[PDB]
Each structure stands twice: as structure tokens, then as C-alpha cells.
Structure 1
Amino acid sequence: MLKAGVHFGHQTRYWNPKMKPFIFGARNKVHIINLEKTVPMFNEALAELNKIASRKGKILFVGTKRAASEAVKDAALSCDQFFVNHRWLGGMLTNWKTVRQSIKRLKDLETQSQDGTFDKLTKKEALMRTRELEKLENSLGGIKDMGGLPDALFVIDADHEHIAIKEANNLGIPVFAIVDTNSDPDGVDFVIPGNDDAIRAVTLYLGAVAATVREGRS
């Protein structure tokens, strides 16, 4: 069922041929993802999310997409979980040993600039240290309270954040993504064939995941 959001199918001709199990060529030369097979895979994903979030595990939500930017922050801060939505830094997970002290720069700098020397040196120094905070803030803000390696990675576009998937396949993190028709379902453990570029879809999938997380925490 196309329940409330429209997650029917995608692009036109540059489909990844590994996703031959999910195709219907429409009259407008556009693929239709098999919506009667999408739902068992999505329920097989949520049955994993209740388990590893009732583990008290940490989900990391990833999607930039220029349109699913705010749906991740809004639809992930409703839980107790963590998000990366603006820019995916190369090596935030497998080079987290040196991303760590950049997080220490962010937390240890808003600690200095909420009350401390945010005016005590120079107007230009406030224009530097503040611009540093708005540069790191929408780069590490959702991952700031994590303080560890995540137990899962919820990717909204495999084709757009394919280096986050390979990133968390160097190490042993079970990633799972909603893939498009042109995406590659290889590193993704629990593939969800659907719509990556609809605001309705990144409300729907991410919202039901958000229900399985906070409803799953017992």
C-alpha cells in the first residue's frame, strides 16, 4: 500500500541492474518499484530496529538530499538518536579517533562561547570563533552527543551517501538504507526498495522508523 506518502518508483534508464527484483517499466519510461515487496522488507527492517534499539543501541541517521535535510533532524530528535544531515565528513566512523577531538572542539567551544570569552577579545575574534561554531554546528551537531561508535546506520540514499555505507562496512556496523532504483544494494544489509527524493517519503519511512525506535524503547 502507498499508505500516505507516494513511494511508487523511479528514475528512467540508469537503473542499477542488480535491482531487477524491483522493476515495472511504466508507459512514461520510468520504473515502478514493487510496492507489494517493499513492505515485507520494511517490516524486516523495523523488526531489527526494535531489537537493536531495545538493546539500548545508537542509531545514526544519514540523509542529505537537499530536501530530506530537515526531515532527519526533525524526525530524529523526536527520538533519543543522532543524525548527520548537512555534510558527510569522510571518516566520521572509521576515523572517529580524530573526529573525536573535533567534537571536543565543538562542545569545548560552545562551552566557552555561551558564557565565557565570546566578547572578551575582538569583534573580529567573535566573527572567527562564532563562524567556527556555525561551521562545526551543522557538521557535527547531531553526532555531538553520541560519544561512541553507533550500532546502526539508517541511510536514505545509497547512491548519494555510498561512502557512508562503505565507511560503516570497513567496521562491523549493520547499515540499512532505503535505496532508489539507481542505487546499489550491496553493502546494505536490510534493503528497502523505495523513494529517496520525496519529502512525503522521507517523512513516511523515517517517521515509521522513528515510531519503532521510541515505541521500541521499553
Structure 2
Amino acid sequence: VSMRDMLKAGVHFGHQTRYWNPKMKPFIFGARNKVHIINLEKTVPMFNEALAELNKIASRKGKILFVGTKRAASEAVKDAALSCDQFFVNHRWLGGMLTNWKTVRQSIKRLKDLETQSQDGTFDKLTKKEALMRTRELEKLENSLGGIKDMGGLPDALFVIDADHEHIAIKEANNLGIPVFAIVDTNSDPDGVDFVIPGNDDAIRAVTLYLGAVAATVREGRSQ
């Protein structure tokens, strides 16, 4: 990929130079149009870090939780993880998935009872104010938790986009020791992020590049 794919995508974009969280300062190259520019000259060796990292994590077959919430990259994440059969949260991060897993696990086990009902296990009973109430109950659960329903226990690696936009998950992960892989733009602060991936986040031309190149490397730590 290198600068070649990084630019035909736009990894070099960074917010306005009037929003930039100063902790990014090593990673920037300039300010074209009152807007920052991310090296793609440090990124490429540093993006390579996480690549050869998730190899190691998927080598023990550990669980990799993808995270993305923006409508822009909401659909990138869901299709990228299921391309690897790993877990993902493409909607709002239900505040407490990790630190409060002893409670969120109840949420999954109740939808896993529910979906058996809603398809075959004796759904069509009376009080049709009851039938739809499940349909909206199941949909709401599946829409925000259906990403990671089969997951079991806690993950071992966590890949996010917009460390800023998703800073709850980072604050949950860092409080559980789980390593955190992020993409942090000029408006974010990687001080929680273990393995940073400096460069433009919000995208699909650029995000399916981060995911599509990551999505593979998980498999070849999994195909082994």
C-alpha cells in the first residue's frame, strides 16, 4: 500500500489547523489550506506495526473487537469483521461493554433467547401488542449488540477508529489492560492508545483500506 494507496485514498488528510490536538505534533508534515497533513512517511512504518501485530494476536486465535460508529465507517466495520468472523460494534458503543461485561452479558443472553423465539420457538402467540414489542426489542438489541453476540468472554485486541469519537471504549479497554489499536487524526490524543495508526479516519475509500488490509492480516494469523 505505502504512500501509493495511502494517497489515492486520502490518509493525508487532517482537520483544520485550528482544531488540532497538539499531541499529534510529531505526526504532522505541514498545514496546507489551514488544514494539517499527516506524514504517510512515518505512518507507513508505524501502520506496519499494527499489521504485524494482529498477526500475533490472531495467532493465539484471540478475539478481535472492531469498533466504528460514524455513519461514514459504520458499514465498513460490520462487513470487514464478518469477512474474518471476528466481532464488531458498528453502532453506538453501549457504554460499559468491557468494564461492565458481567452485566452486558445479560443483554446478549436475553436476545439469544429472544431470536430463537422470534423465528421458530413459539412466537406467534396472542396480544399482538406483545408480538411487535419483541420485534422492536430484538431489533434494538441486534442493532447495537448483534455485532458481538457470539463473543463469549472479553476480547484480547481492540481496533477502533476516531479515538476521540470512541474514547469510551478506549477508556474501557485501557481500564482492562486489553491492548488498543486505533487510528488517531489531528483532533485526537493517542495517550490512551497502545498502538497508534496516525492518519485520516472518517472515510470508506481510506477506511476500507485500513480495514481491508487489516482484515486480511487477521486471517493469516488465523489460517496460520
- Same fold, TM-score > 0.5, yes or no: yes
Q: Distance in 2 between matches of 1:11 and 1:117?
A: 56
Report the structure, 1 or 2, having the larger helix content.
2
TM-superposed deviation, 1:10? 3.0
Q: Which residue of 1 aligns with 2:60?
A: 55
Report the TM-score, using the length of structure 2 for normalisation: 0.93
Structure-to-structure mapping, 1:9-158, within 5 angstroms: 9-158=14-163
Aligned residues: CA RMSD: 1.3
Distance change in 2, residues 1:42/1:193 (3 Å): same
Partners of 2:93 and 2:184 in 1: CA distance? 18
Is 1:6–1:200's contact at 8 Å kept on the other side of the alignment? no
Q: Tell me if the contact between 1:2 and 1:8 (Cα under 8 Å) persists in the aligned partners.
A: no
What displacement does 1:4 show? 4.8
Do the aligned partners of 2:162 and 2:188 also contact (CA within 8 Å) in 1?
A: yes
Quote how far apart the aligned CAs of 1:200 are.
Answer: 1.0
- Which of 170, 177, 195 lines up with 1:172 in the alignment? 177
Once residues 173 and 146 of structure 2 are traced to their aligned partners in structure 1, the CA distance between those partners, rounded to angstroms, is 20
Give the direction of change, closer, same or farther, for the CA distance of 1:45–1:6 in structure 2 (3 Å limit).
closer
User: d(CA) in 2 for partners of 1:117 and 1:12?
Assistant: 59
Measured in 2, the distance between the counterparts of 1:49 and 1:11 equals 32
- Where in structure 1 are there 5+ consecutive unaligned residues? none
Whether the aligned pair in 2 keeps the contact of 1:7 and 1:195 (CA below 8 Å) is yes
> CA 1:168–1:67 in structure 2 vs 1: closer, same or farther (change >3 Å)?
same
Deviations 1:85-106 (A, max 9, x none): 1110111011000001110111
Judge which range, 140-149 or 8-17, deviates more: 8-17
Aligned-partner Cα distance in 2 for 1:57–1:79: 13
Moved more, 181-190 or 8-17: 8-17
Deviation at 1:5, TM superposition (A): 5.3
Aligned mates of 1:37, 1:128 — CA distance in 2: 52
Specify whether residues 175 and 27 from structure 1 end up closer, same or farther in structure 2 by C-alpha distance, changes over 3 A only: closer
| Corresponding pairs, count | 218
Residues 51 and 106 (structure 1), Cα distance of their counterparts in 2 relative to 1, 3 Å cut: same
After TM superposition, which residue ranges in structure 1, 4 or more long, deviate above 2 angstroms? 1-12, 24-27
**8 Å CA contact retained: 2:17, 2:31:** no
Percent identity between matched residues is 100
Q: For 2:198 and 2:11, locate their aligned partners in 1 and report how far apart those are by CA, in whole Å.
A: 13
Which ranges in structure 2 are unaligned for 5 or more consecutive residues?
1-5
Q: Give CA deviations for 1:103-159 in whole Å, capped at 9, x if unaligned.
A: 011111001111123211222111101100010011111110101100011011101
CA contact (8 A) 1:67 1:197 kept: yes
Which whole-Å deviations, capped at 9, do the CAs of 1:144-178 have from their partners, x for residues lacking one? 01011000110111010001001011111000101
Return the TM-score normalized by structure 1: 0.96
Q: Which moved more, 1:192-201 or 1:89-98?
A: 192-201
